[PDB]
Design a protein around this ligand. Structure first.
Ligand SMILES: [Zn+2]
Length: 401
């Protein structure tokens, strides 16, 4: 047989036309309006959109689904407060067993896969309370999930390198255990040492030759300042394109003049950003950043826990949420949001070379029940089929093998 798998009549948005997709093994090897040749299995997209696997560029798989179990979501029957949320996190990581954490990660992964997400980057809490317990469970689950989804693990110094002085050693162990990236939190309001926390993070990064993904929530000018120091140090340490800043809420409230003068520095350092649809500020300059050529991905962030009660791990649902938060309507704008949940996310993860519906690339695809990116966002229709490494793993809202 010429092909292991063929998807007939697949509308490809990047080419704006219907085609057949020829797959052998884990790669796409042919794309034509009508491909001749024998094949083992066939799927009829019936002219509907077929796209590459969605990318959820920022998750917390280890603590997900912790709000579930009761008539009402736990942790939310009281006004939201940063302290009560930080406490809930300490309790959880203290009493949670290795098997508890692993099952949550697996629940999360299955939910993502069912919605077409085949790539994701999760952050794992690393402090003197969670130790490497959470790290061990995540890496274990990651292995058990390699045939369903690709997971990047960030050793996340959640309490701050200068607040929990045990963080640095625990991060080395986590990186030694195999974590793919390292990251800290608010160098300013959390660490109270911008130069120190950033320099240390880069030190650890270089020791294990891993990339960086920083949580920067600080609003206004202090947030932009923190990001500018990070971008500048990125160039200094020869780390162009190896650094991601998550959230960057500060771009929504800092004077636009501050973002305008920093964009050249972000492009020169190849800084990557990720905005989570569970918190993207309405005034966040999303379209502006994309039009400027800045790499901006999208993500679920927390899912049903003490930080965010929401969550279905559905990037298509997230896209609709972004259009409402940002008040977007045109086909071009929805088209940009679709890029954000696909190719932009791929670039954030650094897998763009192998990402995309094109000859020679990975056979990781999603067959939707909608005519186009715009209609899929509007329709919110269920995925009809999900394919990873040339194998069908989801068929009609159910995980096959
Ligand atoms: Zn996060």
């Amino acid at each position: 047989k010429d092909f292991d798998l063929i998807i007939r009549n697949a509308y490809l948005s990047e080419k704006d036309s219907v085609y057949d997709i020829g797959i052998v093994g884990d790669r796409i090897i042919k794309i034509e309006a009508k491909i001749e040749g024998t094949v083992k299995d066939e799927i009829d997209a019936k002219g509907n959109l077929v796209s590459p696997g969605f990318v959820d560029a920022h998750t917390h798989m280890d603590k997900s689904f912790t709000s579930t179990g009761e008539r009402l979501p736990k942790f939310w029957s009281r006004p939201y407060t940063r302290d009560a949320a930080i406490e809930d996190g300490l309790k959880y990581y203290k009493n949670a067993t290795h098997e508890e954490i692993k099952r949550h990660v697996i629940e999360h992964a299955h939910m993502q896969v069912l919605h077409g997400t085949l790539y994701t980057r999760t952050h794992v809490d690393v402090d003197s309370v969670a130790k490497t317990k959470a790290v061990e469970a995540v890496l274990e689950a990651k292995e058990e999930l390699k045939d369903l989804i690709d997971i990047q693990v960030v050793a996340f110094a959640q309490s701050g390198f200068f607040v929990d002085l045990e963080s640095e050693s625990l991060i080395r162990k986590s990186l030694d255990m195999g974590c793919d990236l390292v990251g800290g939190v608010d160098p300013a309001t959390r660490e109270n040492n911008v130069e120190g926390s950033l320099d240390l993070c880069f030190k650890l990064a270089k020791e294990y030759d891993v990339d960086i993904d920083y949580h920067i929530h600080d609003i206004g000018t202090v947030g932009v300042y923190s990001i500018n120091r990070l971008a500048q140090k990125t160039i200094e340490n020869g780390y162009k394109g190896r650094v991601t800043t998550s959230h960057a809420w500060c771009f929504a409230d800092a004077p636009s003049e501050w973002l305008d003068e920093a964009i050249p520095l972000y492009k020169d350092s190849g800084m990557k950003f990720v905005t989570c649809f569970s918190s993207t500020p309405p005034t966040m300059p999303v379209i502006k950043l994309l039009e400027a050529g800045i790499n901006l991905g999208c993500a679920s962030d927390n899912i049903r826990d003490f930080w965010v009660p929401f969550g279905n791990g559905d990037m298509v649902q997230g896209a609709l949420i972004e259009t409402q938060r940002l008040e977007l309507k045109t086909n071009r704008d929805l088209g940009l949001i679709w890029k954000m949940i696909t190719s932009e996310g791929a670039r954030v993860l650094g897998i763009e070379k192998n990402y995309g519906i094109e000859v020679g690339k990975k056979a990781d695809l999603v067959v939707l029940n909608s005519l186009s990116p715009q209609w899929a966002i509007i329709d919110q229709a269920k995925r009809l089929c999900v394919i990873k490494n040339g194998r069908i793993i989801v068929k009609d809202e159910v995980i096959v093998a």
